[PDB]
Coordinates of C-alpha atoms and ligand atoms in Angstrom, one line a residue:
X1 CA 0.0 0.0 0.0
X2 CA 3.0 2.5 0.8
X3 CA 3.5 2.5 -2.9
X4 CA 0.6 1.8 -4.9
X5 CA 0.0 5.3 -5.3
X6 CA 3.2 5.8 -7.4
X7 CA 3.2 5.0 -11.6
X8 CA 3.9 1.6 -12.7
X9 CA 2.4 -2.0 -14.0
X10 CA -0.5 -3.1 -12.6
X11 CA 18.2 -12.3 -24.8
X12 CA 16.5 -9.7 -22.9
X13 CA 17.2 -8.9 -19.3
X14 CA 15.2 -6.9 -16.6
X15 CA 16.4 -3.6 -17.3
X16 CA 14.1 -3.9 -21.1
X17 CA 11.1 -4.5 -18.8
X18 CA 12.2 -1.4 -17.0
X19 CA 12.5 0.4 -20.1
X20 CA 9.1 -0.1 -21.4
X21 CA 8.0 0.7 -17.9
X22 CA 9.7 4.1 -18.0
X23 CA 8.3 4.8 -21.2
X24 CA 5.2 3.9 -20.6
X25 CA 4.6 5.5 -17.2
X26 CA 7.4 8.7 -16.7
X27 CA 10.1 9.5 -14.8
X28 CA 9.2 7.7 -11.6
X29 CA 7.9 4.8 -11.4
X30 CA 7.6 1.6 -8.9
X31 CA 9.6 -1.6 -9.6
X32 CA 10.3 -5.0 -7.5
X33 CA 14.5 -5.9 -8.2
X34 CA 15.8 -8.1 -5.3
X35 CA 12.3 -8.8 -3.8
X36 CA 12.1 -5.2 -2.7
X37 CA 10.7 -2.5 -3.9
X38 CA 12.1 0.2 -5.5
X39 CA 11.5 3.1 -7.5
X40 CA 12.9 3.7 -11.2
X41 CA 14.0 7.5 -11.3
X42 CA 14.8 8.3 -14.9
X43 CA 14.6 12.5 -15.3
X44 CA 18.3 13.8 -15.8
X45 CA 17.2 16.3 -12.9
X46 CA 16.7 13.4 -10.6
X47 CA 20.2 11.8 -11.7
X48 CA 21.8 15.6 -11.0
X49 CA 19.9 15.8 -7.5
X50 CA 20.7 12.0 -6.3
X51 CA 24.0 11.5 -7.2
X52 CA 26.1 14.9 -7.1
X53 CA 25.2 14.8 -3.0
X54 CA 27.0 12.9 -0.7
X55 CA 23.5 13.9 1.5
X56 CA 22.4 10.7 -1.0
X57 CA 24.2 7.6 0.5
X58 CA 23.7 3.9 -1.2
X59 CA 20.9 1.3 -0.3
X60 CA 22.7 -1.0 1.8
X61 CA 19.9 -3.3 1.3
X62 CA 20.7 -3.8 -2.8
X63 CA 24.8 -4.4 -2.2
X64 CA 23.4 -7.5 0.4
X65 CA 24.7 -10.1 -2.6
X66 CA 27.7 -8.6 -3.5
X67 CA 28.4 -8.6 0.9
X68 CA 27.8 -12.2 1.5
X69 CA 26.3 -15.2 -0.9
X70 CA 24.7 -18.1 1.1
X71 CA 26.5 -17.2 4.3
X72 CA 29.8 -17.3 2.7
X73 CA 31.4 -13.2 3.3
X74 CA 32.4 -12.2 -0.6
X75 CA 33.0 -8.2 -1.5
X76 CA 31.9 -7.8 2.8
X77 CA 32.2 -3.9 3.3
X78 CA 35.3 -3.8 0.9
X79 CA 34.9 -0.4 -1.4
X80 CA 31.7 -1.2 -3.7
X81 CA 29.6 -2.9 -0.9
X82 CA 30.4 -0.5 1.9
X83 CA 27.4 2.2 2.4
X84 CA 28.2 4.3 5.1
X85 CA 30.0 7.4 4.1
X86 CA 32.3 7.7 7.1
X87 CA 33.5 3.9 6.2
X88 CA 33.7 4.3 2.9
X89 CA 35.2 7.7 2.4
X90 CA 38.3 6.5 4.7
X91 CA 39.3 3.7 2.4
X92 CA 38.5 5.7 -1.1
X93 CA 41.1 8.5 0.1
X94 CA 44.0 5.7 0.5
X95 CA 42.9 3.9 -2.4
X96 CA 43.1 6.6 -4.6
X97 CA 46.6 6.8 -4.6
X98 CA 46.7 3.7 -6.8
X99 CA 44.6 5.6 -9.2
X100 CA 46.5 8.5 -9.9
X101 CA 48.1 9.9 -13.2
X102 CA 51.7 8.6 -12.4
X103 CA 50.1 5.0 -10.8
X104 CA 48.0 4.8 -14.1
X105 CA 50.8 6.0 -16.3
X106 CA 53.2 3.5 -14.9
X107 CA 50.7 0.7 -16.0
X108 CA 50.9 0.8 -19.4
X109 CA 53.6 -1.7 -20.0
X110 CA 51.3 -4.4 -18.1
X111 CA 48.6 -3.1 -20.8
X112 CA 51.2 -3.6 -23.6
X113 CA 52.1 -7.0 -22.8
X114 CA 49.0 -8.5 -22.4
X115 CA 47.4 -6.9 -25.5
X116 CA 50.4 -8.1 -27.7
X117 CA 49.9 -11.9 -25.9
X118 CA 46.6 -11.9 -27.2
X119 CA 46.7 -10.7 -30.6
X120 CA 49.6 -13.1 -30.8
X121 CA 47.3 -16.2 -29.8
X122 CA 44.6 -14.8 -32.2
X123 CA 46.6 -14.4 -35.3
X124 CA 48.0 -18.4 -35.2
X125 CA 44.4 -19.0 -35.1
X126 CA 43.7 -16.2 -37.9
X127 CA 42.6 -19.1 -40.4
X128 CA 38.7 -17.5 -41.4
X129 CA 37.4 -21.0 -40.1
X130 CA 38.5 -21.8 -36.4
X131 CA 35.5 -20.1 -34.1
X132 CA 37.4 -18.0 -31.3
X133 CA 35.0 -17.4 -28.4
X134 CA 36.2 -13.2 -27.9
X135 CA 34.0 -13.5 -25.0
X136 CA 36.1 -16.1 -23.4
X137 CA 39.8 -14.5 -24.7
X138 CA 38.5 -10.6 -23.7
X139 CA 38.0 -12.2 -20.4
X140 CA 41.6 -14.4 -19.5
X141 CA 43.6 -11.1 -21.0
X142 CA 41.7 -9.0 -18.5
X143 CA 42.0 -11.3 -16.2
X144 CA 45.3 -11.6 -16.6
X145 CA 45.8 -7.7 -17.0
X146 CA 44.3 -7.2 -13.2
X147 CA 46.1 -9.5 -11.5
X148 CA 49.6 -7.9 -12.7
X149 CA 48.7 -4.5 -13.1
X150 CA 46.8 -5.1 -9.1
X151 CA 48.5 -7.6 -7.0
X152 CA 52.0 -8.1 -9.1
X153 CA 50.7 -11.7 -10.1
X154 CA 50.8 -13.9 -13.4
X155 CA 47.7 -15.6 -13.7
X156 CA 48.6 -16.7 -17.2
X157 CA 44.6 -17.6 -18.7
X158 CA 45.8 -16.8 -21.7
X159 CA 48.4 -19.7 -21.3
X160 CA 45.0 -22.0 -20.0
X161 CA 46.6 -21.6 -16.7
X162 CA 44.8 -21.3 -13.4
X163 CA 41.8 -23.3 -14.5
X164 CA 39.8 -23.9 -11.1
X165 CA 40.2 -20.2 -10.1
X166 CA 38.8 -19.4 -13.6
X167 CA 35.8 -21.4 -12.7
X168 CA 35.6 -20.2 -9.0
X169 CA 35.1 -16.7 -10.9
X170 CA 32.2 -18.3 -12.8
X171 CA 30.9 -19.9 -10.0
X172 CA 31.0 -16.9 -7.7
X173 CA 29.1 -14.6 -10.3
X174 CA 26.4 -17.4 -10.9
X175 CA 25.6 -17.2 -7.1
X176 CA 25.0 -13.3 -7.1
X177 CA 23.4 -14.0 -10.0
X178 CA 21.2 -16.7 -8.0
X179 CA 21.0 -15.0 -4.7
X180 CA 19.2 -11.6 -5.8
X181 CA 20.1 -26.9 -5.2
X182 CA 22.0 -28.9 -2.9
X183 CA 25.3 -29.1 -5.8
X184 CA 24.9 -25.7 -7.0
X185 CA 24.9 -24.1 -3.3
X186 CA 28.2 -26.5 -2.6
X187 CA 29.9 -25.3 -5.5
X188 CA 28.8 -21.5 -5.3
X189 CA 30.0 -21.6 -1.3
X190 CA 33.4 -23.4 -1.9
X191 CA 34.1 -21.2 -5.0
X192 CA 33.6 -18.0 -2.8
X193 CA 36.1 -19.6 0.0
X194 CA 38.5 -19.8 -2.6
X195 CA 38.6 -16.4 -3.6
X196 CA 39.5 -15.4 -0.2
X197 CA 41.9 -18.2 0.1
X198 CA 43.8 -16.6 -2.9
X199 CA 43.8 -13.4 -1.3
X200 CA 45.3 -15.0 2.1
X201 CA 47.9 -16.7 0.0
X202 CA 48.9 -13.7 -1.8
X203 CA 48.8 -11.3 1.1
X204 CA 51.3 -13.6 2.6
X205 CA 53.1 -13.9 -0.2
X206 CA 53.7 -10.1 -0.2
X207 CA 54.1 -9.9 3.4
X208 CA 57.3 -12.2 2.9
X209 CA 58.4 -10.2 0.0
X210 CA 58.2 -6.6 2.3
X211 CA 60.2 -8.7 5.3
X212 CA 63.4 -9.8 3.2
X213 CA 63.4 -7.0 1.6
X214 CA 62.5 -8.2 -1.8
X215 CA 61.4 -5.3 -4.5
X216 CA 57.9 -4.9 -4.6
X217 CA 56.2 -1.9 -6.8
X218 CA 53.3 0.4 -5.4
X219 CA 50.3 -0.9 -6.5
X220 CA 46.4 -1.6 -5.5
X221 CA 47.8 -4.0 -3.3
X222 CA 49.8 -2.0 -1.9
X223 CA 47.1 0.9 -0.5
X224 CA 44.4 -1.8 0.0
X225 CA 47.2 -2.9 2.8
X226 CA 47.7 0.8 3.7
X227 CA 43.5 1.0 4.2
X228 CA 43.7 -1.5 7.2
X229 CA 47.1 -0.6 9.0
X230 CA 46.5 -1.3 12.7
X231 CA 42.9 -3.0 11.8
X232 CA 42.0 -6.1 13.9
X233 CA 42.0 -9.3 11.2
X234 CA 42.6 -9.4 7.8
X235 CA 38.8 -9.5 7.3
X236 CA 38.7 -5.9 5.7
X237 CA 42.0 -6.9 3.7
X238 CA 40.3 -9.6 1.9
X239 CA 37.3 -7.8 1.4
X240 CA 39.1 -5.4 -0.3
X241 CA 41.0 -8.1 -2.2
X242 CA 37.7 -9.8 -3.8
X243 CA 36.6 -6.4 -4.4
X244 CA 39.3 -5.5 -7.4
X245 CA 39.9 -8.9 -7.9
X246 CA 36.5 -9.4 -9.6
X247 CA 35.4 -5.8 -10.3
X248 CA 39.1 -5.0 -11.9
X249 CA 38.7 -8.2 -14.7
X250 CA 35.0 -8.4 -14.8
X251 CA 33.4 -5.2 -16.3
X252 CA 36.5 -4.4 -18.6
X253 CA 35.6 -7.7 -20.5
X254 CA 32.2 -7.3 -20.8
X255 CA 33.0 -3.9 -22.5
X256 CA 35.1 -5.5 -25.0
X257 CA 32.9 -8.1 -25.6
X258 CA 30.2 -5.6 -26.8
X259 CA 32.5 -3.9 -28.2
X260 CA 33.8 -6.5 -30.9
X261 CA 30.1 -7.9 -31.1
X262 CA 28.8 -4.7 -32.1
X263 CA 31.6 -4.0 -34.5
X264 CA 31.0 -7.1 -35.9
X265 CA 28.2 -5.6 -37.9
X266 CA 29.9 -2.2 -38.0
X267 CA 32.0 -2.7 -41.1
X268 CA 32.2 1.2 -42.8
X269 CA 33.2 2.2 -38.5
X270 CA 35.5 -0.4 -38.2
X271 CA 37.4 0.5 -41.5
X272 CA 37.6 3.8 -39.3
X273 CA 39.1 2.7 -36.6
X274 CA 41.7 0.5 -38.5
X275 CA 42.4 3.9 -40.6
X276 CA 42.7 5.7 -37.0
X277 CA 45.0 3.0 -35.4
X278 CA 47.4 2.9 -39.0
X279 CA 47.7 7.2 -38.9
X280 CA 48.3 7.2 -35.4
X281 CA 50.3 4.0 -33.8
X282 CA 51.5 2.4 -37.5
X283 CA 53.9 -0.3 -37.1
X284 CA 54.5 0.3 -33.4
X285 CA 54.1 -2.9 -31.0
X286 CA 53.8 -0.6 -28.2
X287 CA 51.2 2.3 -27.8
X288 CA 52.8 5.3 -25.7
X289 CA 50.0 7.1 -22.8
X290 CA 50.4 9.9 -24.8
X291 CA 49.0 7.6 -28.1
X292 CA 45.6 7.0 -26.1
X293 CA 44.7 10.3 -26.5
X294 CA 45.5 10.8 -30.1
X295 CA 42.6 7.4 -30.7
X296 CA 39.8 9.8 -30.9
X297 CA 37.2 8.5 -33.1
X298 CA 37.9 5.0 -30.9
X299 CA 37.1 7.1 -28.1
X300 CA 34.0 7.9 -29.0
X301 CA 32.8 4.0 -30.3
X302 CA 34.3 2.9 -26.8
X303 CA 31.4 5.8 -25.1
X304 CA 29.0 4.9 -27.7
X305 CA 29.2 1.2 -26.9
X306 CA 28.7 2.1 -23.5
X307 CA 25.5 3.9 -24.1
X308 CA 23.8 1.1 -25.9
X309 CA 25.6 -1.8 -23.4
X310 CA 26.5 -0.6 -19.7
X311 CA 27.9 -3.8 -18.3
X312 CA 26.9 -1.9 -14.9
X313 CA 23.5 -0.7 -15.0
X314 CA 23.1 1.7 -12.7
X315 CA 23.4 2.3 -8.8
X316 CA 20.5 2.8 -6.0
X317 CA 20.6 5.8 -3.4
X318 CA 18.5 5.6 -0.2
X319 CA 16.0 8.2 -0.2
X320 CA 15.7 9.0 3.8
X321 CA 13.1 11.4 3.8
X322 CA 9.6 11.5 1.8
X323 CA 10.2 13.8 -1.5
X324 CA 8.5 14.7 -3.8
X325 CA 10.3 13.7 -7.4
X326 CA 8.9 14.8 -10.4
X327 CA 5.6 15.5 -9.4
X328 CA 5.2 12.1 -7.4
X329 CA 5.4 11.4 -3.9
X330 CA 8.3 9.3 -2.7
X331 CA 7.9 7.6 1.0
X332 CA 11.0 7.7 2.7
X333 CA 12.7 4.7 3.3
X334 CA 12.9 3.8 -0.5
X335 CA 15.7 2.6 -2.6
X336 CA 15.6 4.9 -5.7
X337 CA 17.1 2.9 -9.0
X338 CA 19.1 4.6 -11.5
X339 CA 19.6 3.4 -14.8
X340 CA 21.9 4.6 -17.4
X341 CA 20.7 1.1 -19.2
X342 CA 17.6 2.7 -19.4
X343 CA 17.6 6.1 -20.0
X344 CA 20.3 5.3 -22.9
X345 CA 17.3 3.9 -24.8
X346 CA 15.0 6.6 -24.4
X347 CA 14.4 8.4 -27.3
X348 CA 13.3 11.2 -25.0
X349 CA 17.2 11.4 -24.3
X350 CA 19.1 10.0 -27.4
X351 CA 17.4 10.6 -30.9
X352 CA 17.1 7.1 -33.0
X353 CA 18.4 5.3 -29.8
X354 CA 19.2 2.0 -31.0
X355 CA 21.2 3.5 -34.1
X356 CA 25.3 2.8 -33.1
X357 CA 26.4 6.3 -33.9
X358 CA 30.1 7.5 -32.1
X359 CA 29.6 10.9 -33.4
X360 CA 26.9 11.3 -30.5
X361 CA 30.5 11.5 -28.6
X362 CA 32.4 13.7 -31.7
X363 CA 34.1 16.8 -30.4
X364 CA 31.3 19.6 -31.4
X365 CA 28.0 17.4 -30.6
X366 CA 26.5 18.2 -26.8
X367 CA 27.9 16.3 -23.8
X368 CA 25.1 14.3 -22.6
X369 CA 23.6 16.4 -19.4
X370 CA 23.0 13.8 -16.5
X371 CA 21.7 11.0 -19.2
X372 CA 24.8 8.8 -19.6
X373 CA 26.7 7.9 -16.4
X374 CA 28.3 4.1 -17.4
X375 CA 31.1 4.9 -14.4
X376 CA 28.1 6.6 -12.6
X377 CA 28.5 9.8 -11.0
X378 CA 29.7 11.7 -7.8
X379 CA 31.5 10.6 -5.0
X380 CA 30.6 6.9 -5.3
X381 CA 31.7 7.0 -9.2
X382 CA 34.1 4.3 -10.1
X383 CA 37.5 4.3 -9.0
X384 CA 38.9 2.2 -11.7
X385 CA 37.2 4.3 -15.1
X386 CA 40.8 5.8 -15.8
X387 CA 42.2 2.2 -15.1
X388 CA 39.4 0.3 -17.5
X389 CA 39.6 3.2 -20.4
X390 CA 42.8 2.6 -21.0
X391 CA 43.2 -0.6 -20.8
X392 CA 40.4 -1.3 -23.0
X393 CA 42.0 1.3 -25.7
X394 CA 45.3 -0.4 -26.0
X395 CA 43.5 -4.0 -26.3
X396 CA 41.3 -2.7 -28.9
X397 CA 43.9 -0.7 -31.0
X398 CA 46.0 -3.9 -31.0
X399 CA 42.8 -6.0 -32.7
X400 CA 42.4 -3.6 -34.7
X401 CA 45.9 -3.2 -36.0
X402 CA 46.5 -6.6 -36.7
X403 CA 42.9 -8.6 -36.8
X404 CA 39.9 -8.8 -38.9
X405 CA 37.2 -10.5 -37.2
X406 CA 33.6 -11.6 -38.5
X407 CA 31.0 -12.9 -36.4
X408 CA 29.8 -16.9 -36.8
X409 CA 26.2 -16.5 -38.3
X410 CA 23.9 -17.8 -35.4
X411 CA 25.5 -15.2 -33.2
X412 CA 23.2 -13.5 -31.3
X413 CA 23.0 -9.6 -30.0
X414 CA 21.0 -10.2 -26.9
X415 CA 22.4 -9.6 -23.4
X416 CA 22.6 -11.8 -20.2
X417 CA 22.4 -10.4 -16.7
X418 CA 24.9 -12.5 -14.1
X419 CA 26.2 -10.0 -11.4
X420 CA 26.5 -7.0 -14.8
X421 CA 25.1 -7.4 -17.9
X422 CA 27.4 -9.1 -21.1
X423 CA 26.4 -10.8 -24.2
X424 CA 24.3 -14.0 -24.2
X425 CA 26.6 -15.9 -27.1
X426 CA 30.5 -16.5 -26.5
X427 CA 30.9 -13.6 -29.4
X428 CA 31.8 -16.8 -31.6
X429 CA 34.4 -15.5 -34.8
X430 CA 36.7 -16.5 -37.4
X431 CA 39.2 -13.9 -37.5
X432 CA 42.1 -13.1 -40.8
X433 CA 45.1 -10.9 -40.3
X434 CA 44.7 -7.5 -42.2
Ligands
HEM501 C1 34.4 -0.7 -18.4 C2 34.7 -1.0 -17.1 C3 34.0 -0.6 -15.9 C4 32.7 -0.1 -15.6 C5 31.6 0.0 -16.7 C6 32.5 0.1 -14.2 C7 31.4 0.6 -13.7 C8 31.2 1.0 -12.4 C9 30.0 1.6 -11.8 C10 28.7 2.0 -12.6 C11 30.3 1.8 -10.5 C12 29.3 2.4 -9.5 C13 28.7 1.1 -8.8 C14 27.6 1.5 -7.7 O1 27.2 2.6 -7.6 O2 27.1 0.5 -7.1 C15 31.6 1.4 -10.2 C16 32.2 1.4 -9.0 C17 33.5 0.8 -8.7 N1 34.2 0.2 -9.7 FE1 34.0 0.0 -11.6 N2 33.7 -0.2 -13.6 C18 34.6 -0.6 -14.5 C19 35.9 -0.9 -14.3 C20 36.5 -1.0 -13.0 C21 37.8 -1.3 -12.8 C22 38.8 -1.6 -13.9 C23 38.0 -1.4 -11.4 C24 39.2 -1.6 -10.6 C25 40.5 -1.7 -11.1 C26 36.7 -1.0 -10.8 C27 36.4 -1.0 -9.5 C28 35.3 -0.3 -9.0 C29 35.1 0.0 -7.5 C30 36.1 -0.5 -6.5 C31 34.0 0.6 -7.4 C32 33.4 1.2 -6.1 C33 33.9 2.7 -6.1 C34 33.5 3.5 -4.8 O3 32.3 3.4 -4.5 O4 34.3 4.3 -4.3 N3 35.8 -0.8 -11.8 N4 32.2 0.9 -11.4
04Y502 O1 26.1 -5.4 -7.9 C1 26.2 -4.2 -8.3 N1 25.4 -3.2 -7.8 C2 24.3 -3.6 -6.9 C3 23.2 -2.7 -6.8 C4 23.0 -4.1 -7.3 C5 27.3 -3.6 -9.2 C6 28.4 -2.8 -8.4 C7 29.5 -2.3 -9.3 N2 30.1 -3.5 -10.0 C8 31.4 -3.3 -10.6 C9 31.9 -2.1 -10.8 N3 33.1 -1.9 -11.4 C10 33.8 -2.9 -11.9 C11 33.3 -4.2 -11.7 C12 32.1 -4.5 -11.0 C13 31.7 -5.8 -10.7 C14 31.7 -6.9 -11.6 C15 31.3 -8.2 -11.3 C16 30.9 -8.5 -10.0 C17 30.9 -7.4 -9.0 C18 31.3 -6.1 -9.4 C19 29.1 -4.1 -10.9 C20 27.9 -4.7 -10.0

């Protein structure tokens, strides 16, 4: 009763039902996600309002399965799961250190030498015949990108190394997935223990290095340490570990793997970027930082793919007090659900929506206003965007300088939600060098 006064019902995922909901019935209107109710807030005014104001603090309640899955403590109150401010605003300031312009800078080479790895593996198998999952590969190389760049370890996926962590990862995302019988709860459990066990064992690992005086560069690892100096246990630690673990891989591939799908069927923008990447890198192995800004027009297909495929959706703020939003009446108490997902698709906000179109992102055309957030916004914006945008440049400047790939007919479009949203199909091709 609290809400049925407010607007709403009476390879697609959740956020399309939300979509027709918003178009149907305004800027506000009421939802169930995680068997709770919520309330979809889709005005670029509300966006502005909600998230520019650390007065707006995150739902706790809608983070519960990235805390703990089926009793087992996963992200806990680690950076993306923690909601109070005072908590959270203690480890962002020492985490940020990891994140600035000389940390980022520095990273490059770990970019580098993980892009070349893969476009190495792809061109032996550059035969126009042998399917290549780019899902799958997009995933090990950023995979394999986080845990050098983060914690100063080879995970090697790209070798086929590391298998049963590779499938703890799966597991793990299937029970968020699940969570907002008997085998599956087992597997999803002992999968989330081993994440932690992974961070013990590297933790430990470093700890050792640090005592015989071994070199070890300043990395995430290396502040997420910092964040719990004098703590209690290592609870926080490993919290923390998860955290960039997961979230450092996880949406990066997802990203290329719309990305490359898209493109697929993108032929005249893709002769584009390859003309971009030949004028600007050439022969070059190695893109220099100061490259990644020259790639413009990829730029711009990298925000455009975001628009149309946001591996995270959105965010929720706790609205404390009732408010009146839009002309309806919000009871406090209520998670409110933004959506970048959907407001993307409204042609209220982008003319001709679904059309793939990177000169919505070209130097003179207007900067969205509060209608496009795939980092989000504010103070509880990612802290990895700098980190993901250019890693995600130097892998896609390298397939394009030295791959041509076309998707397996049967391929679909269509999305899947696990813990973000990524493409249904493996993004199945047959690649050919240029
Ligand atoms: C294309 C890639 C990425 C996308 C689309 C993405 C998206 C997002 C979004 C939407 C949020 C806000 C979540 C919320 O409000 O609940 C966020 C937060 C966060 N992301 Fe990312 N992310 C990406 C890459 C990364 C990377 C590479 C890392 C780490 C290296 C990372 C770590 C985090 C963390 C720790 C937070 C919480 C930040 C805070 O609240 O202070 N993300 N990300
Ligand atoms: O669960 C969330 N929000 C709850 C309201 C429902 C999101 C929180 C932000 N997450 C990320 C943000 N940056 C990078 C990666 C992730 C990431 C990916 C895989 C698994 C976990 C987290 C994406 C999920």
């Amino acid at each position: 009763s609290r809400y049925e006064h407010i607007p709403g019902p009476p390879g697609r995922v959740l956020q399309d039902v939300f979509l027709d909901w918003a178009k149907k019935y305004g800027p506000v209107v009421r939802v169930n996600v995680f068997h709770k109710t919520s309330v979809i807030v889709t005005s670029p005014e509300s966006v502005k309002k909600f998230l520019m104001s650390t007065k707006y603090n995150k739902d706790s309640k809608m983070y519960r399965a990235l805390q703990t899955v089926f009793g087992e403590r996963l992200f806990g109150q680690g950076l993306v799961s923690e909601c109070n401010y005072e908590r959270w605003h203690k480890q962002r300031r020492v985490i940020d250190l990891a994140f600035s312009r000389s940390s980022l800078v520095s990273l490059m080479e770990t970019f580098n030498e993980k892009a070349e790895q893969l476009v190495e593996i792809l061109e032996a198998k550059a035969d126009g015949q042998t399917p290549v999952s780019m899902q799958d590969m997009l995933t090990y190389t950023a995979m394999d990108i986080l845990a050098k760049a983060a914690f100063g370890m080879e995970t090697s996926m790209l070798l086929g190394a590391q298998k049963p962590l590779s499938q703890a990862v799966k597991l793990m995302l299937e029970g968020i997935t699940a969570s907002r019988k008997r085998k599956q709860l087992r597997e999803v459990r002992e999968s989330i223990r081993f994440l932690r066990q992974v961070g013990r064992d590297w933790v430990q690992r470093r700890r050792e290095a640090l005592k015989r005086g071994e070199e070890v560069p300043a990395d995430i690892l290396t502040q997420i340490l910092k964040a719990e100096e004098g703590a209690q246990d290592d609870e926080g630690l490993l919290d923390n570990f998860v955290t960039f673990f997961i979230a450092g891989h996880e949406t990066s591939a997802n990203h290329l793997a719309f990305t490359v799908m898209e493109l697929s069927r993108q032929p005249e923008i893709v002769a584009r970027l390859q003309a971009e990447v030949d004028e600007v890198i050439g022969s070059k192995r190695y893109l220099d930082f100061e490259d990644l800004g020259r790639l413009q027009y990829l730029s711009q297909v990298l925000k455009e793919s975001l628009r149309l495929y946001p591996p995270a959706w959105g965010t929720f703020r706790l609205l404390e007090e009732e408010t009146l939003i839009d002309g309806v009446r919000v009871p406090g108490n209520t998670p409110l659900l933004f959506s970048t997902y959907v407001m993307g698709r409204m042609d209220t906000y982008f003319e001709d929506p679904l059309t793939f179109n990177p000169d919505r992102f070209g130097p003179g055309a207007p900067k969205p206003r509060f209608t496009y957030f795939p980092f989000s916004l504010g103070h509880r914006s990612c802290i990895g965007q700098q980190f993901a945008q250019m890693e995600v440049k130097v892998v896609m400047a390298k397939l394009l300088q030295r791959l041509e790939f076309r998707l397996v007919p049967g391929q679909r479009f269509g999305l899947q939600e696990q813990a973000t949203l990524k493409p249904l199909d493996p993004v199945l091709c047959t690649l050919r060098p240029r």
